[PDB]
Every structure is written in structure tokens, then in C-alpha cells.
């Protein structure tokens, strides 16, 4: 099973302030450790601290500006960082990791996309995308639907719930007058469409939502 | 048993607890002193057999003063126990002597 | 800090051929180096732990070497799967830190 | 009191005055020997305590002549006073076994 | 004498910005550094000591950090009354040194 599991998203004001969650199992010893990674987007990882739940003791990088407040609860086995007075410069993917106190992080958060900006939480409108009736096709053929106007990042899509892989790009969200827009795509055989669905599922952490549409052909 | 073997195996019980003890405090002491070697379970409990010993290897050393006093801990746990075994030895040979003396 | 430098920053290499990233630490650190991989979205994935132990779910095809402040991470016949970055992180003074990442490409 | 349990105390009161006196004349000795690190208070008692157990971590040591006196005077202080430690306890021992004896 | 190397001598930065001076040492002193400033006319007031301790009366965004030969004296939210030289000094080996001196500018 998953072993640390954060929330997908926070978005965040100017000088606000968020708590993301880091909620463990699997073993748990009271040696265990559990620490912090900041990724900037298109930066690597940086270190920015740690703790010992099972005491309560946090230590920090020093090397950059204290934003974080590290804290456990013991009994949920949850790991708390609390960022406050942010800015963009504090917009990243946040990953926790756990270590058993020899040195190496042996699991990872899948992470928090903290968005630091003024404007609002917007859902997708997932749009198919379908072939013209006039086009002709090869033993494969590819279809795939456009999620558009969206805030903030990230977006999670697959095909029929994770089942169809292979045949899957997913191109990287543009930013435009403050909404998020991107398509993902996938191909097929041209024999098992649309005899068998193909269906784009869209999770929106931010907002919570989790929409899909069927490929269904035109007209 | 006599009293001088049954605290020879208590003192060797009561080391091996602080060994243990001690390295799992010496890391938490040390985490968060830049710099600090003696921020991992395996290594800090190899330190803690060097420092009761004092074999001397120099590879490991606390630098933080919550560290340093887990090791004065450990120094003495050690020094004394070990010093526990041959009074233990000594008062065996001792008691051999006065029967090999007929007394 | 112990400052890790890995260099290239991007390496070029054919598909099968075997390829070698390094990683140069600015003091002596032992053995205490730890690798990872990261795709594109995913998160960090260890896959060598202390210079040259391998993890459970990782290919035989990945394996590491060096001691003191010189550490390589070989990939045996490079595959697609293996496109990534690639950083090297260490234990041996606090805090733990991180290289620069170097991204493998075919 | 037996004797051997007020001198194993009273060593140690010895002791500890030797750490504190020779870490204070260890940084006296030391400053003004280029290359000298036993200079301030803190780490020269830590030194004094390194020295008296013999624990080897060789992270500090004098440089000068008198720095060097005075740290003999601390190990044979420490390594004598731990030792009359496992005398004391010998002593013990040895008149436990008597007694068990019937002696 | 261990020699601590302060570079660059001047440094340029904006109102309320970050701004890290950096102390190198000629050799490994583990946290033994301390940070000084000097505005004009004035003498040196202690800032930071054994690289990262805070002094009483001295404002939280004046931070430090480093170990062994790399030392860095940060200012979170650079202001005007920041306006001085800048000091590290060891007290590793004898005899104590001291920087070259660093001068911020706003
Ligand atoms: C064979 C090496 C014994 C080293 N000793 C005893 C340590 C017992 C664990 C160090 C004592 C330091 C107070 C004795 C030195 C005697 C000169
Ligand atoms: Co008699």
C-alpha cells in the first residue's frame, strides 16, 4: 500500500499561511523520521527540515529563510509543516519522506502543489476530442479530450480510471489570463474504438472535483 | 551465585541498556549541530562501544554539549563495568588463595 | 553543508548503451551516498542506498560505486523507462543534502 | 563509612576539581602557540573529561609543553581515580565472600 | 593564522530584499565563527556567534549558517540602517582572525 499521503493542493494568498498534512503507515518505529523537500518547478530538491514524531524534535535548514514549523501527532501518525507569511517565491511541490534514521529517504509523499497567488479556485470543463467524420485512419487511432480553464495546478488525467496506459501524453498545462489549459491524448487500435469506451478522467485536487467523458465519435 | 558474579552479568545487563539508550540520544542531540556525524542509529551505537571501551579510533565524536554529556555517560558506564569485571576476577582468585592457604 | 556536484547536468546516450552519472562531494563521506530517480511528475524513487546497496524493485541493470568524495551511478543498457533525473543526496554530516540533478536522455 | 567508599568519593571530588583547574590552565598554557586549538573554556573541559577517561576521540590536544603537563596531570588524575574505583568495589566483593563463607 | 577570505567586498542589493555575505576559511573550523557589524563611526557590534547563535537586541531577520570552511551572514528584508561593514572573526586556532570585511549597499 501507499505510505504517505498528502493532500494534492493548496492554494494560498499573499502573506497567508497553510498546514499541509503528511499522514503515515505501514511500520512505524519511534526512531522513524520524517522530512520535508521543496521543488520549485524546473529547480531540484531542496531540504528544508525534519522531524522525530514519536518526541517531538525539529530541526531545519538553516541555510534558507525559516518558513516552516515542523509538528506530529503522535496518534494519527500525521506530520504537519506549516508554512506562513508566503510569497511566490514559496510556490512548489511540497514532498514528505520518511526515514528510518540511516540516512535515506525510503518513501515519499506523491506531494502538495502550494500555489501562492491572489485569484480563485477554478474546475475544469473537460472537452472530447474526437476525430472529423472526413479523416481517414490506420490500425491505430487517436483520440483525446482538453481540460481548459482551470486554476491552480495540478490536474491528474487518466484513461478508464488508470486501465489504459500505454498510448497516454498528457502535454504541460499554459498559463493565460489566469487559468490553467491543457489536453491530454491517447491511442488505441482503430478496431476497438468505439466497440470498447475510452474515457478521460479528470481530478481537480484544488477544487475537489473529479469529472470524465466518454469518447463518443461524431455525429 | 555470588554477589561479585551476579554484578559482574548485572553491570554487563545495565552497559549494553546504555549503549543503546545512548546512541539513540546521541542522535537526537546531535541532529541540527551543521557539521555532526553521529546522526544515525548504526553508526551512533558502533560509537557508543567505542566510547565505553575507549578503543580510541577517533571516527565519531559528539560535537553538541547534550551529545558530549550522553558520552560522559557512556565513558563511565563503561570504564566502571569493565573495572567491575576485575574486581569480580579479583575477589575470585582471592578467595582461591585463602583455601589453597588452608584459612 | 556538504555541497554535491553532479556534472554533466544533462547526459546523451543511446538506447542499450550502459551510461555513468557522478556525483562529487566537497568533503570526504564515506560510503554515504544515496541515489534517486524522478520522472516527469513522479516523485523520488531510491534507487541505491550507501554508494552501492540495491533496493528491492529496482532493476539489476542499476548499480553505483565510489568511496570518500567520488560516487558514480551506473545504468547496465540503457531503456526508455530509465529517461529521468537523476540526483544523489548524503548522510554523513548534518544536514543531509542534495545534488544539482542530472537528466538522462537517449 | 568504610574507608574505600569515602575515598572513591573523595576522588571523585578530586577529580572534578582537576578537570575544572586544568581546563582553565590548559587554555592559559595554550593561547599564544600558533596552531592551538585547547584556547577557549568549554572545550578545554571537555578536553580535561577526554583525557581523564582516556575515551581517544582525538579531536583536541595541547600543542605547548605546559599544556602538555598539565594533561598528564589529568590522565594520571582520571586514570588513578577510575582505578581506585575498581578497588573500592573489589573491596566489597572480597568482604561479601567472607562473610558468605562464614569467615 | 587561519585566513578568512570575505567575497565580494561589496554587495549590492534592494531595499527589503535577502542578502547573504559569505566568509571562506583557509581551513576547517567546524562552527567557530562570529559576525560582526561596523557602521560608520561606530565599533563592531557582535551580530551572530558560533556561526548561527543569536545575540540579545540584535533584529530576527539577522541570521547565519555554515560549517568547516563555508560561512554565510544572512539579512531576511534588507533596510537602510543594514547600511554597513560586515565582520566574521574565528576562534578555531590561535591567534583569532578576522575577515577582510564585506561593506552592504542599498
Ligand atoms: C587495556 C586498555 C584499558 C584502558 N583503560 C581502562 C578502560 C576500561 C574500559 C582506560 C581507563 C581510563 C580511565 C585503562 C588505562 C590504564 C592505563
Ligand atoms: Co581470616
Given at each position: 500500500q501507499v505510505q504517505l499521503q498528502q493532500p494534492g493542493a493548496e492554494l494560498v494568498k499573499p502573506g497567508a499561511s497553510v498546514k499541509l498534512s503528511?499522514?503515515?503507515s505501514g511500520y512505524t518505529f519511534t526512531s522513524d523520521w520524517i522530512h520535508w523537500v521543496?521543488?520549485?518547478?524546473?529547480?531540484?530538491?531542496?531540504?528544508?527540515?525534519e522531524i522525530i514524531p514519536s518526541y517531538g524534535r525539529a530541526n531545519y535548514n538553516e541555510k534558507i529563510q525559516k518558513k516552516a514549523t515542523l509538528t506530529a501527532d503522535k496518534?494519527?501518525?500525521?506530520?504537519?509543516?506549516?508554512?506562513?507569511?508566503?510569497?511566490?517565491?514559496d510556490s512548489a511541490v511540497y514532498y514528505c519522506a520518511r526515514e528510518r534514521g540511516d540516512g535515506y529517504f525510503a518513501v515519499w509523499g506523491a506531494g502538495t502543489t502550494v500555489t501562492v497567488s491572489s485569484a480563485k479556485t477554478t474546475p475544469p470543463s473537460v472537452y472530447p476530442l474526437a476525430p472529423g467524420s472526413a479523416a481517414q485512419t490506420n490500425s491505430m487511432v487517436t483520440l483525446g479530450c482538453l481540460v481548459k480553464?482551470?486554476?491552480?495546478?495540478?490536474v491528474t488525467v487518466t484513461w478508464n480510471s488508470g486501465s489504459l496506459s500505454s498510448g497516454v501524453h498528457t502535454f504541460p498545462a499554459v498559463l493565460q489570463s489566469d487559468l490553467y489549459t491543457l489536453s491530454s491524448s491517447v491511442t488505441v487500435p482503430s478496431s476497438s474504438w468505439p466497440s470498447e469506451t475510452v474515457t478521460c478522467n479528470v481530478a481537480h485536487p484544488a477544487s475537489s472535483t473529479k469529472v470524465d467523458k466518454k469518447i463518443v465519435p461524431r455525429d | 551465585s555470588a554477589l561479585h558474579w551476579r554484578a559482574a552479568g548485572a553491570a554487563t545487563v545495565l552497559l549494553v541498556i546504555v549503549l543503546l539508550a545512548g546512541s539513540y540520544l546521541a542522535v537526537l542531540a546531535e541532529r541540527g549541530a551543521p557539521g555532526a556525524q553521529l546522526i544515525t542509529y548504526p553508526r551512533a551505537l558502533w560509537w557508543s562501544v567505542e566510547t565505553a571501551t575507549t578503543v580510541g579510533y577517533g571516527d565519531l565524536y559528539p560535537v553538541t554539549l547534550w551529545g558530549r554529556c550522553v558520552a560522559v555517560v557512556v565513558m563511565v558506564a563503561g570504564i566502571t563495568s569493565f573495572g567491575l569485571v576485575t574486581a569480580a576476577?579479583?575477589?575470585?582468585?582471592?578467595?582461591?588463595?585463602?583455601?589453597?592457604?588452608?584459612? | 553543508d556538504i555541497l554535491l556536484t553532479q556534472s554533466p547536468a544533462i547526459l546523451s546516450v543511446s538506447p542499450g548503451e550502459r551510461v555513468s552519472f557522478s556525483c562529487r562531494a566537497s568533503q570526504s563521506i564515506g560510503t554515504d551516498i544515496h541515489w534517486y530517480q524522478q520522472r516527469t511528475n513522479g516523485s523520488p524513487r531510491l534507487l541505491i542506498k550507501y554508494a552501492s546497496e540495491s533496493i528491492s524493485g529496482i532493476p539489476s541493470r542499476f548499480s553505483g560505486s565510489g568511496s570518500g568524495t567520488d560516487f558514480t551511478l551506473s545504468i547496465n543498457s540503457v531503456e526508455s523507462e530509465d529517461i529521468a533525473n537523476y540526483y544523489c543526496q548524503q548522510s554523513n554530516r548534518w544536514?543531509?543534502?542534495?545534488?544539482?540533478?542530472?537528466?538522462?536522455?537517449?
Open positions: 503528511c499522514k503515515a521543496k521543488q520549485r518547478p524546473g529547480h531540484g530538491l531542496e531540504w528544508i527540515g496518534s494519527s501518525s500525521t506530520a504537519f509543516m506549516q508554512l506562513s507569511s508566503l510569497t511566490s517565491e480553464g482551470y486554476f491552480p495546478e495540478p | 576476577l579479583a575477589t575470585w582468585f582471592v578467595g582461591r588463595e585463602q583455601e589453597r592457604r588452608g584459612h | 544536514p543531509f543534502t542534495f545534488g544539482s540533478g542530472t537528466k538522462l536522455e537517449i
